[PDB]
């Protein structure tokens, strides 16, 4: 996942470039796709800032190995981000992290 792949995943899927933010609960990490998109007039980020935000998110998706989990979740799921329902993507780092732990 790059910031490029991330926006293209949102645009090919739902036809809008949505905001994506990380959330920690119980010690798990989730990528919550907000229902707010840059095509909205009252979006809190400008065009460039929004894209730098996507690429910053995508940097973590690459670092943690949760990028595959996003590209597997969104593509298969029929969920759309709606007012009150965020697409809270479970970033499994079970198999994804244990590679660099080196399981003998």
Structural features, described:
The structure is a monomer. The relative contact order is 0.21. The chain has a single domain (1-104), classed as HIT family, subunit A. It has four helices and three strands, in the order H-E-E-H-H-E-H. Strands 1-2-3 form a three-stranded antiparallel β-sheet. The longest helix has 18 residues, at 47-64. By secondary structure, the protein is α+β, with helices and mostly antiparallel strands. The chain is globular and about 55 Å long.
Sequence of secondary-structure elements: HEEHHEH
- How many domains? 1
> Regarding CATH, which class?
Alpha Beta
Alpha-carbon distance between the two ends: 28 Å
Proportion in β-strands: 15-25%
Gross CATH architecture: 2-Layer Sandwich
Sheet having the most strands = 3 strands, antiparallel
What is the helical fraction, as a range of percent? 40-55%
* Individual helix count: 4
The total strand number stands at 3
CATH superfamily: Protein of unknown function DUF3067
Q: Would you tell me the structural class of the helices and strands?
A: alpha+beta
CATH fold-level topology:
HIT family, subunit A
Main-sheet strand order equals 1-2-3
Q: What gyration radius follows from the Cα positions, in whole Å?
A: 14 Å
Principal-axes shape call? globular
Protein name: Alr2454 protein
PDB class: structural genomics, unknown function
Keywords: novel fold, Unknown Function
Assembly: monomeric
């Amino acid at each position: 996942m790059t910031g490029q792949e991330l926006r293209q995943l949102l645009l090919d899927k739902w036809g809008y470039s949505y905001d994506v933010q990380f959330r920690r609960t119980q010690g798990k990490i989730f990528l919550q796709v907000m229902w707010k998109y840059l095509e909205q007039a009252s979006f809190p980020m400008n065009e460039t800032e929004y894209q730098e935000h996507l690429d910053s998110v995508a940097n973590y998706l690459h670092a943690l190995g949760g990028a595959v989990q996003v590209k597997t979740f969104i593509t298969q799921t029929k969920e759309r981000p709606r007012l009150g329902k965020a697409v809270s993507i479970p970033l499994d780092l079970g198999e994804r992290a244990s590679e660099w732990i080196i399981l003998e």
